Amino acid sequence: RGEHALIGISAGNSYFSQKNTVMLLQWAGQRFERTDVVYVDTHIDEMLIADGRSAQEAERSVKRTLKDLRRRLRRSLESVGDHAERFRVRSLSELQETPEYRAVRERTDRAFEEDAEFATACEDMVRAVVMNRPGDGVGISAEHLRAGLNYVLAEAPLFADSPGVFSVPSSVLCYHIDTPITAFLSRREGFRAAEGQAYVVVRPQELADAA
C-alpha cells in the first residue's frame, strides 16, 4: 500500500545478516510498491587510511568487504527469489552518477554550509559513524572526521530527500536502532527533510512478530 521504501545497507551495519536482510526485504515487499536497496560502497577507504592503513591495504580491504556484502545480498535476494526484480539494488557509487542524485546533492551540500542545524546534525552523524567504525582503531583524529564527513555527505541526499533521489512522491527510510542515522534524527529542533520523506524504525522482533 505504501509508495516507496529505501533500505540502506552500510558495510558496517551488522544488523544485515542474510537472515535479517531476508526478513526486511519480505516485510518491505509486502508494504511498498517500490523498494530501493542501496549499499554504501563509497569513502570507506578514507576511514581505513585514517586508522593507519596504506592506500593499497585499504583498497584491498574495501574490495574484500564489498565482495562479501554483494555475495550475501545476492544470497538474500535468492532467498526471496521468484520476484527479486521487485527490488532495485544499486551501490551508492552508481546512484551518485544519476542526475536525480546530483540535483539533490547540490541542495544538501549547500544546506550543510548554510544551515547551522543541519550541519550540526550531519556532524553528530559523522561522530556516530566514526565512533562505530570497523576495526581496531580507538582514537579519533581530524582525519577520521574528514573521512566521516565525506561519507555522511554522500549519504545525505538519501536521508534528506529520497523522494527527489528516487523520483517518488514519498519514501520511507528503514533504519535499525543505534545506527548513525539515529544521531542525525535526534538532533535539536524548524528544519525539515523534503515533503514525503519518512523514517521508519525496523525492529527484528517486530518483523518476526508480523511475519
Curated annotation (Swiss-Prot):
Keywords: Transferase
Superkingdom field: Bacteria
GO molecular function: aminoacyltransferase activity
Active-site residue numbers: 10 (nucleophile)
Effect caused by changing residue 151 to A: Almost inactive
Gene3D superfamilies assigned to the protein according to its UniProt record, in alphabetical order: Cyclodipeptide synthase
Presence of keyword Transcription regulation: no
Top EC class for this record: transferase
Any one of the GO BP annotations: antibacterial peptide biosynthetic process
Function: Involved in the biosynthesis of albonoursin (cyclo[(alpha,beta-dehydro-Phe)-(alpha,beta-dehydro-Leu)]), an antibacterial peptide. It uses activated amino acids in the form of aminoacyl-tRNAs (aa-tRNAs) as substrates to catalyze the ATP-independent formation of cyclodipeptides which are intermediates in diketopiperazine (DKP) biosynthetic pathways. Catalyzes the formation of cyclo(L-Phe-L-Leu) (cFL) as major products from L-L-phenylalanyl-tRNA(Phe) and L-leucyl-tRNA(Leu).
Protein name: Cyclo(L-leucyl-L-phenylalanyl) synthase
Source species: Streptomyces noursei
Lineage: Bacteria, Bacillati, Actinomycetota, Actinomycetes, Kitasatosporales
